[PDB]
Structures are given as structure tokens and as C-alpha cells.
Amino acid sequence: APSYVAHLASDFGVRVFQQVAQASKDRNVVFSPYGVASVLAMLQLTTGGETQQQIQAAMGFKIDDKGMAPALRHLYKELMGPWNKDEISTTDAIFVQRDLKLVQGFMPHFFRLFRSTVKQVDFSEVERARFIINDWVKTHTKGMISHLLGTGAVDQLTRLVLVNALYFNGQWKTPFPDSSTHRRLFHKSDGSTVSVPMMAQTNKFNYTEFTTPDGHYYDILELPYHGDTLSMFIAAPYEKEVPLSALTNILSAQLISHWKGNMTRLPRLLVLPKFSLETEVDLRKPLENLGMTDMFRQFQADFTSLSDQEPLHVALALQKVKIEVNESPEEIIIDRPFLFVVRHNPTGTVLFMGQVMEP
Secondary structure, three states: OHHHHHHHHHHHHHHHHHHHHHOOOOOOEEEOHHHHHHHHHHHOOOOOHHHHHHHHHHHOOOOOOOOOHHHHHHHHHHHOOOOOOOOEEEEEEEEEEOOOOOOOOHHHHHHHHHOOOOEEEOOOOHHHHHHHHHHHHHHHOOOOOOOOHHHHHOOOOOOEEEEEEEEEOOOEOOOOOHHHOEEEEEEOOOOOEEEEEEEEEEEEEEEEEEEOOOOOEEEEEEEEEHHHOEEEEEEEEOOOOOOOHHHHOOOOHHHHHHHHHOOEEEEEEEEEEOEEEEEEEEOHHHHHHOOOOHHHOOOOOOOOOOOOOOOOOOOEEEEEEEEEEOOOOOEEEOOOOEEEEEEEOOOOEEEEEEEEOOO
């Protein structure tokens, strides 16, 4: 059961990422597949009718079913354990109107399943409501993500806000020597070149070569973090002309697990560029393409499990991810666009995903 829900959370989150990357061609994007699954699973308890059916059908599981929520509670405790060492910061929050009569029994049931509460804020005080959302993210990401650019859209009419924020800056198992860091040329998808600092180290890295259904070769390299608890999978096509879209559209939790199994250690000189990327995305259009259309529509939305008094709808759905990648004879030069995956090896959870077009 804990490995089963982690597989469903990863599969759903990859499908959301595949939609955000489709509308972000030739541009840097960082997304948390595990993060978007957590907020959507919490929202599954606030919904009713056909609105609740649309989320359950896309996610592949019902949150009220036996052993579904205790498996996610065990997963979060495992991911935020003693190994953490201030590398990851996860936060999930749902905001609703303060003077709104909630269904008697919702609040105790919500805390029983996620060990969290739905925050009640007055949206009449626009600037005060904007501060509470930004301050909640600030205090729960240890001050890494302090502001959300999407909060500038909330007003006196806003009644429901969905927010998720993730931070990553992991410690490598075998760190990169700072003396090897030098500025190298990076080729862009349009044909232009840019000079960016690149890390280098000689080690026995896990390597594999896979093929796309079209018939194009692509290589995968594994970079483990301290205690092998986490690993970064760098995916890039063999041919310089092949775009990253071909590799993105075929992603899944099974494929990443299949990459690890077919991998064999090889002595190489890896040249990986340094990148500190940040991306904030509105989840209206990506969740709409997956089937969840009702939750955003004013009259078609059903949130009877949260409140039957006033009609509600998701006015704002956001995710802000900040990833940091720093230092702490055959060669592999990563000097062209590539894909990255941050996997939690014991459960197989896809924590982070993205495409680096320009570091």
C-alpha cells in the first residue's frame, strides 16, 4: 500500500508535468510531481458530485478508501526523516473564506487523514490575505520561497486558493571538486551558444542507453545523493538535432525504475552544468487537459463536502518550485538541453522533474 499510492502519485504528477512542458517549449521549467498529487488528494476530500469524479479518475485512487491516507502520511514522514539534512522543504495549503459555514464533520475528518487544517482567511482584506498565503510558504520552506507571484490575482471575489511549494538543494554522495569548475559553451535549441559555469569529476557512474518508440537513441546517467536515498537521472538524446519533447511525452514512474535496473557503472569524466532554476505555474490549463474542468467553472463546481451553504470554485491553483544544483579517459559533456528527475529510491516517488534549456 505505501509503495502503491507513491506509484499513483508519481504517475499522475508526470501527466501534469507532460502538460506544463508542452506549453513551455524551448524554456526552463521545474515541476514537483509528488507535490501536485498531495494538494489534489487533499482537494478530493473538499469536493463532491461530478467534480470529485473528475479528480479520482485522473489520479486513479479515492482518498476516503482504506489504507490510502495512512500510506501518504507514512510516505511524508519517510521523506522528512532524519536523513533530510535541510535538503527538501515541502508545504501544502488550502485557503477558504473565514465567514463561510463549513459542513459539521469536515474539519475533524481532514486533520484525521492529512494531519493538517484548511486555513480560513478574510479575502475582503486583499493585502492581508496575500500576506498570510506568502507568510505560510515562507515559514514552511525555511525562508527559501517567501513570495508567490500568483497571489497578485486574489481579490474581494476570491473564495478558494490551492497552493504548493517545494525547495531542493541536495548533498551529493561524491561531491564535485571546485578546482574543476570552469565556464564552458552551452548550445541552445535555436542554434545559439552561451557561456555558463560547468562542474566536472571522474567517477564510476551508472549509465544506460534507451530508445524512443520513434527510433531515436537517448542516454541516462545516475548521480546519487548522500546515503543513496535520492538520485538524479539526467536524460538527453544521442542526436543533437532531436528535441527534448520526444523524451518528455514517453515519461512514467515505470520507465525511470526500468532505467535504474538496466544501468551498469562505467568510468567517465562527467561535465554537468551548474543550474539554480525557479518556476511558478498556474494549474488551470494543465488540470483541464487531464479532465478536471468543473473545479474551475463558477457554477459547474461542486464543493458540497467543504460547504453546502455558499457555491465555491477554485479561483487560484499554484505550484512554485526552486531547485539548486551545485558542487555540494572518456568524457560525457552535458553542453546541450537535457531532462532531470529527482527520485526517492526506497519508494520510487518522483519528487522533482524538469528540462534545462539554458542553465
